[PDB]
Amino acid sequence: ESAWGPAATIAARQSATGTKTDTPIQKVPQSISVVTAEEMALHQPKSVKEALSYTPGVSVGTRGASNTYDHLIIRGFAAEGQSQNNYLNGLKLQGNFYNDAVIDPYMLERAEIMRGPVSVLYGKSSPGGLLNMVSKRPTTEPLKEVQFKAGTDSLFQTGFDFSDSLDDDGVYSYRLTGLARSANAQQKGSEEQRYAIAPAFTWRPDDKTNFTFLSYFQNEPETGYYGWLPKEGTVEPLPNGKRLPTDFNEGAKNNTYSRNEKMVGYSFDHEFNDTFTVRQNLRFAENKTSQNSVYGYGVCSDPANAYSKQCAALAPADKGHYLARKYVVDDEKLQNFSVDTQLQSKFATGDIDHTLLTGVDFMRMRNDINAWFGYDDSVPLLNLYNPSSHHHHHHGSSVNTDFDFNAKDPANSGPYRILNKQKQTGVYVQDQAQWDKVLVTLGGRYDWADQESLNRVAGTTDKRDDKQFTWRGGVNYLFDNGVTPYFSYSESFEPSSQVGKDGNIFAPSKGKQYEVGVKYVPEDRPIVVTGAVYNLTKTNNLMADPEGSFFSVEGGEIRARGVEIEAKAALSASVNVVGSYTYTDAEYTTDTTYKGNTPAQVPKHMASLWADYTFFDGPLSGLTLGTGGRYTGSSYGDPANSFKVGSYTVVDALVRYDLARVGMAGSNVALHVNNLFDREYVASCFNTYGCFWGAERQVVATATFRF
Known part of the structure; x- marks a missing residue:
């Protein structure tokens, strides 16, 4: 299993969103959760947001049935001024005002969430709370x-x-x-x-x-x-x-x-x-x-x-x-x-x-x-x-x-x-x-x-x-x-x-x-x-x-x-x-x-x-x-x-x-x-x-x- 790829079961052992280096989740000293492409192709989420309901520490109804934004409240905290704090491949999708982007779950390989301070590896960030999506990449077989x-x-x-x-x-x-x-x-x-x-x-x-x-x-x-x-x-x-x-x-x-x-x-x-x-x-x-x-x-x-x-x-x-x-x-x-x-x-x-x-x-x-x-x-x-x-x-x-x-x-x-x-x-x-x-x-x-x-x-x-x-x-x-x-x-x-x-x-x-x-x-x-x-x-x-x-x-x-x-x-x-x-x-x-x-x-x-x-x-x-x-x-x-x-x-x-x-x-x-x-x-x-x-x-x- 590769932090940047699939995972066999909805149980991913490997994630890179925590130490920036591919590592067993057990060897990772912080709270990381990983939602598989599999877990997603099970509920057919509408958004990366919805794709997170069986994930502890995250609310997603902070806007009820609306999906305009994948704005989340992690550990009771969130970015200032209703902006998001979403990352796509170790890089942040920095937006501002009504200008926040979202990526469809069907283009994602896995959606990861890191609970707690993340500045240690990413810079300015809301206290405790980061979302990182992994683009789908080319497959081994057709x-x-x-x-x-x-x-x-x-x-x-x-x-x-x-x-x-x-x-x-x-x-x-x-x-x-x-x-x-x-x-x-x-x-x-x-x-x-x-x-x-x-x-x-x-x-x-x-x-x-x-x-x-x-x-x-x-x-x-x-x-x-x-x-x-x-x-x-x-x-x-x-x-x-x-x-x-x-x-x-x-x-x-x-x-x-x-x-x-x-x-x-x-x-x-x-x-x-x-x-x-x-x-x-x-x-x-x-x-x-x-x-x-x-x-x-x-x-x-x-x-x-x-x-x-x-x-x-x-x-x-x-x-x-x-x-x-x-x-x-x-x-x-x-x-x-x-x-x-x-x-x-x-x-x-x-x-x-x-x-x-x-x-x-x-x-x-x-x-x-x-x-x-x-x-x-x-x-x-x-x-x-x-x-x-x-x-x-x-x-x-x-x-x-x-x-x-x-x-x-x-x-x-x-x-x-x-x-x-x-x-x-x-x-x-x-x-x-x-x-x-x-x-x-x-x-x-x-x-x-x-x-x-x-x-x-x-x-x-x-x-x-x-x-x-x-x-x-x-x-x-x-x-x-x-x-x-x-x-x-x-x-x-x-x-x-x-x-x-x-x-x-x-x-x-x-x-x-x-x-x-x-x-x-x-x-x-x-x-x-x-x-x-x-x-x-x-x-x-x-x-x-x-x-x-x-x-x-x-x-x-x-x-x-x-x-x-x-x-x-x-x-x-x-x-x-x-x-x-x-x-x-x-x-x-x-x-x-x-x-x-x-x-x-x-x-x-x-x-x-x-x-x-x-x-x-x-x-x-x-x-x-x-x-x-x-x-x-x-x-x-x-x-x-x-x-x-x-x-x-x-x-x-x-x-x-x-x-x-x-x-x-x-x-x-x-x-x-x-x-x-x-x-x-x-x-x-x-x-x-x-x-x-x-x-x-x-x-x-x-x-x-x-x-």
Whole structure:
């Protein structure tokens, strides 16, 4: 098994997303989880996001049924300003504002998640939390795949995945994965559309040199729903005891969302001799996104709309059933070039076997935004009272009306025009000194992250050149009985793009995490079990000014302590299992307002279990029947902890039938169902005016062929 390739069972022993060097997960001192291409081709995820529900320590409903972004909340933490923190092949997909990219799961070989500080090898990063996707690469043997989807909400995807070699020796091979997927969103009137193709090509001038060219070109005319809904009408009943339907849409009829992605790069390794191997990863990309959208702000009786005129023009006891709305027109575009180069030194010194890593990582990102935002009374209120029982059962709600957008009035709105620039360069060193049954990993990294933002309208330019250092130390006790005890100390760091009252960019926040755990990785069977418990802390977090002045004051702190366990196995050539449990206790240690409060959108309890079975005998030969469930506990739906979003449990199940029995081995047809008991839940709220209906039971019929 190769960190950059498949894994046989959904139990991957080898991963590189932790030490930058291909290593057994047991020998890795930090919490790593790996979702196989197999595990994915089991649920037919819509996004890398969804592909992560049986993964401890990760929420994915931080936006309910919406998939515009693979924004995740790992260990109760996430990037500042709702941006992602997603990596693709050891290089970060740095985005900014509504400009974050996503890669389709069907072009991925595996999706990996590293919990805890990751700055030691990657640079600036949100405390505890990284996602790294592995592009699919050329296969050893030919691959002729054609896949056909068809599911609820008029979902229809048609894609392929091919790979072969030009010569007979394989010095020249490639791969071309691509798909066309279209469907209707959960919310009425909203649509989803994606067109993606991934060209790959690997030159192996021998058996010590490897150069894979990895490109991904994606285009999405319409990205789907991305609006907010009041706790009033979702989590809590509306005045008239009725709630808004799960498919209710509060945005304009002419609401539009689009994103375009284009990236070319390569991964390359070369082994010179017995002690030195060099590898370099590089990617350039330019991505754009534009949108015309009317989102929602709470009900008129919601504090936020305190200064809304249209709101304060309704009978004082009529405000709790009317919705305030705002809008935004955006159109951005950014380029992101990245390169990582590293030298691996394999040598010893009297029984101390060494694996020393030394490397420089560099990147720059430039984003140009030209948006427009609607403020109070910027768009006609909505009488939410209407959605009743005729909108629930006997049909669903109806698409509201168009909206202007073009006629940007100076009263209700104004312009937003910024140009954020980003640049980071870092050097790191790490040694995987294995001294017999005592693998001890250690290393650190220095960083030069400089930023610069130009506000067009305001004609300003704030900029800050941060320089930080991070290191991580840990040990793993290799027991021959499979068990591998371990513990480690790690650090992270993340700059602020925010400006203080002193007209200056706040100094970055930090991350310190203490973690210990056990990794069961028996060499005989294909089963992996990991358990771990940690104490993660975020420093210098921004908090409300003690004097209250529109400007926030740094100094706040937050702690995240918890326990995580996950398990994936191959209990039989017919039985396969995956499950996990997550205990997450996140708290404000220091903060002007909130303190001791739990951050919204992060539940204390989370657990998931899923198992499949394939019959290789009875008249049900070539038949897999699988099912599972994901549980998310109650969570606070706003910083003040005003209310709570109620816990829920959704069931998943599937059935596949190996089409071999019709002269088509390797092929098959499958049926996947999510939220089997078409449950109704509220994924979460990030505030009183921002709640998201969970995904309403979905069913997909997939046929995938292998020539």
